[PDB]
Amino acid sequence: VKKQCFKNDIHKLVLAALNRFIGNPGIQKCGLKVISSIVHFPDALEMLSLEGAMDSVLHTLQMYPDDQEIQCLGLSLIGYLITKKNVFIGTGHLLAKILVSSLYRFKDVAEIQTKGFQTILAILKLSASFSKL
């Protein structure tokens, strides 16, 4: 059933819906939740990386600094869909900027900090140069 759903181009449709429509934050929360459910599917990673979902997630985090649920879902997601290509040859400055900004703005929220630090550890597992950034 999951393979059939994936073959139905669910990822492309949901990414287009949440990327083309940057307003109406409710659809953004729904899209982040749907992607979060998508990622742990058996074949999710390769198509998600090919479609370029990571840029959409980063843009969503940029346009919604103050919302809590969007930030939590995005910070949990970023570590999930991060690949070596996204931090290729040591380049990952928008990643560090967004992660530090999100963690600093919400310092007391335990869940946001936990997700952000798990994401940061996952990123550091790939490339050690990121720490410098």
Place this chain on the structure above:
Amino acid sequence: FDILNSAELVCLTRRILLPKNVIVECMVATHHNSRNASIWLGCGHTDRGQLSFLDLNTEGYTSEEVADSRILCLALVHLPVEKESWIVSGTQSGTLLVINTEDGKKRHTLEKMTDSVTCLYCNSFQKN
């Protein structure tokens, strides 16, 4: 007058627009100074390396997908013996493809390096 009062307008000889939505990362020039003025481009708009050929005198763009990972850098090697010309590619996976500048069916890989090949600069000291 202010638009015409510029050196950018005098010394910008040609301007070529590539096909829609292509991300080319590296370029080299087919420069034997007498063979064929043209450009080799390494596309990166997809995670499967494409080598494209740009004929300058006709603005002809012909792409070809040959690499599993995106091409990072390109280099042109010219061996004077037998008038040999080749072009070598460097892929993100680590491979190193070599295809003839003239012949199109001379694909042959080389040692698969540990990681990505970020430079392929070629020069002679004597020996190339």
